[PDB]
Symmetry: C6
Subunit: 201 residues, 6 copies
């Protein structure tokens, strides 16, 4: 029966959000980590053992795989989802340590404090999301070609290198882009609702 | 002893369903995720390491494996079962946050609201199921041939490529098709029963 | 202390069985899933990486491994044990949803109903078991030869192909057959006892 | 606080054993499954990928690995420990279903029954242990030679085949033999104590 | 409801820290072990199977991989995070065994003791962090070159050896360096706050 | 709230130890199993697939890997830590079964007994530790050379064989030696304190 304090914590954390925003954000988060856990990581299993180039020079395959992928997409999405999940955990720990000290002060004695940090966290989530989307557009684009051309030393003039299952990776890149855009739009919607409520006093 | 609130939640979520529909849907769901977890994924383990073609041109195997399978069947079924399980979780979160706020309003004060979302979710499950069945029929069919012919650059004119255990994959494709059809039929049956009860007022 | 309702559920589910049948069926089930989880699946690990044929024609190994094993024994036994465990779970969910609604009706108001479904489930278990035993006898037999002969296109006239550890697979096939026969005999014994009690009125 | 019924169950199951026998049997069981889980199974990982023979005939390696090991030692010990752990679980389930029905009969009404099954189980454990020890002595012996000679078709007259890490497997075989003998001796000691107490009336 | 004693323990352990230091240290710790568990270890999977050298002399690859990496970065960071997490666990166990004995002494009878060990632990964390940073700078630097030159016996005069994905490892090395510096700065901040409070008496 | 009996058990087991010995032994144990679980076992992954010799004779690599490593270091440390953790579990089970029977005898009736077994267990831990250290010194030493010379049949006169990452294994061997010596010193310290208290009567 020790679940009422968790209910008061879930009340105090989601005090300012819309009743529609909470369910969609939670379901989208569970969807994101389940998709990244089950289907996506098994598709990038042999991302280097199947990468073959058309040459005989020893060491050309490693440097051409270097120049093709500066960072894999899976660890990119892991870093992105961790950086997005950090400020909600910071808000959670802050609200928990406020509630304990406040109950202490109230057992002794028988807006602008908590709203501001909520605004800061919901700003930082959108800022991190748009930063990661811009970096992913600048580095890779939103497709993968089946034939890559490599011009790095110590290979000869130009060699051809062939990727590994690029169609499936293009499909999953499009899915992660759609999920990212939906998350950004929902956070912007929550910001707009809170600042629309705030002007009516 | 903190299980009565979960009993009230299980009462309020399944308020409109048939007593026969609930047990068959739950057992079918457990059957589906257990079959997809244990037997199916281990059969698609070496779907690229055993794919051999009859050529010497370097890079023909990767592009012919590309043209053979635009997306693997396992991640297809994972995406399908996640898209089917999403609206039930949305209904669950909606009903939970209704019940908490309603108990708050009732502790303060000592059809068409919840039925409509139920109709929306049970429509969306069938729509997603028939969409995934049509896409799987359009892309792959419902069999796998042991010999595939490939006509993609930079290979020569036509090469032969041989798949990996296609009989077992055909058997499991037929099982997943049967499970999909049974799920669609049961959801249509539940819709028909609810709309048959609704006209008697 | 929230375990008495599970005790009433375990009372109401096993109301008609023999006191000797329940312990042997439960211990046999735990034995079956433990044997299938630990020892059996690790023996079928390299069922294709060690399958070698005596030829040079590219693609003969895949089609001869196809013709040798239409479906692996491990996923066969997984499908068999899932199809056997399904009707007991259906009976469990039915009895649980009967008990909740009956306690509701009793809190409002301060044979042939449940026996028939029990008979149906204990019929369906034996029917599924004898069906799977007949299919396994018709497809594979109950042994594995160390030398297999293959006559499929695009190989030449006849090639020899050598299996991977067939002695150990023969031993485990005999164990699974013995477990299957013991399960069928015990379910027939329970049916005979219940129909022998039923005629005395 | 729902742990007193488990205490009464642990009282009623170990009613007849020595106070020294219980701790040594339980610690030996935990020792056995921990040793078989952590250290032993990782040593038999590459038991076929490292088995090389001195020939060029295709298919000689599979049949010589067949003739060398009819069944691997790891699955042998798994089968042995499962067959040894079965009768204690049968006694547990029997005593539990006796206790529930007896408490029912006692809530209604406000040696030779349980001793015999205990004697049967503690006989069957020793019988299964000595059977498995005799079979392991008859098939393999208690050592592994580094050089094996093979005389099976379709190889030529005699080929040499070299095993994989036989020293470490000899050490672990000696450890499992010592553990087996200690288990048999302790069960014989418990039988002797119970039959020594039984004659004094 | 057995969570109040853990609340008193969490009160007594964090008695002297800043309200801002605790949330940032806990979130940084969870961030560190999650990053080291998910993304980092999968990038160092094939750190030896993809390391190729430009030679024919057998045994040059093993000794050049030896001279390139005296210790892998992953096990280095594991050792570092374990050595950093040790003194907090020592403080935890000390405070727990103080609290139990003190409650015993208080049930019998119906600064400088605990502050000093806190100062010792928060000194030792910073000392271990700066030691590991200095060793990592002295051995490897903070980058990885794609081409390594090897001059060890029994190779000839000088051979070229090519690493495996050095760009991604450079990125993750920079991330771990940034996390290390942030941890050191926060521990120095907590030391400065406690010694700034201590002089005001 | 069912945690007070575990508190009485933790009181009765650690009744004779020093307040400083318990925290250091528990933290050292957690340190040992965490280091052996995470970092050490992944370093010994390819201990045979990367072991190459300078020869053409088939079967020389297996017998030279045999003569190099009679038993791997990982399973050696697993056996050592299990043999060290056994007598504490024996003492735990003995004290638990004493406490239950003593509470039974006390509910009926409304030094030299427990100290001796504690002395026996804390003797046996040190004896097993010094035995394992002497065996590890006698077999392997405390280093690993990068070049090993092999003189076993059926190889020719003398071949050279090259190990796999010996520097990292030397570092981890030194760490395990340091942990072993610290454990032995702490157990000797606890013995000395208890026998120093015992003479004052």
């Amino acid at each position: 029966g020790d679940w009422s304090a968790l209910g008061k914590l879930l009340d105090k954390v989601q005090a300012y959000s819309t009743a529609g925003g909470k369910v969609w954000l939670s379901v989208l988060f569970i969807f994101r980590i389940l998709l990244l856990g089950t289907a996506v990581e098994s598709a990038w299993g042999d991302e280097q053992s199947a990468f073959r180039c058309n040459t005989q020079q020893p060491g050309c395959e490693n440097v051409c795989y270097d120049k093709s992928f500066p960072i894999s997409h899976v660890r990119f999405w892991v870093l992105q989802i961790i950086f997005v999940s950090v400020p909600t955990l910071l808000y959670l720990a802050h609200v928990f340590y406020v509630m304990r000290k406040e109950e202490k002060l109230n057992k002794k004695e028988e807006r602008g404090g908590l709203l501001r940090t909520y605004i800061i966290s919901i700003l930082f989530k959108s800022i991190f999301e748009v930063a990661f989307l811009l970096i992913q557009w600048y580095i890779y684009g939103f497709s993968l070609s089946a034939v890559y051309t490599c011009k790095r030393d110590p290979c000869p003039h130009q060699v051809d290198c062939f990727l590994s299952r690029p169609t499936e990776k293009t499909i999953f890149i499009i899915f992660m882009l759609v999920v990212s855009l939906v998350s950004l739009a929902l956070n912007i919607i929550e910001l707009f609702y809170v600042f629309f409520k705030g002007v009516k006093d």
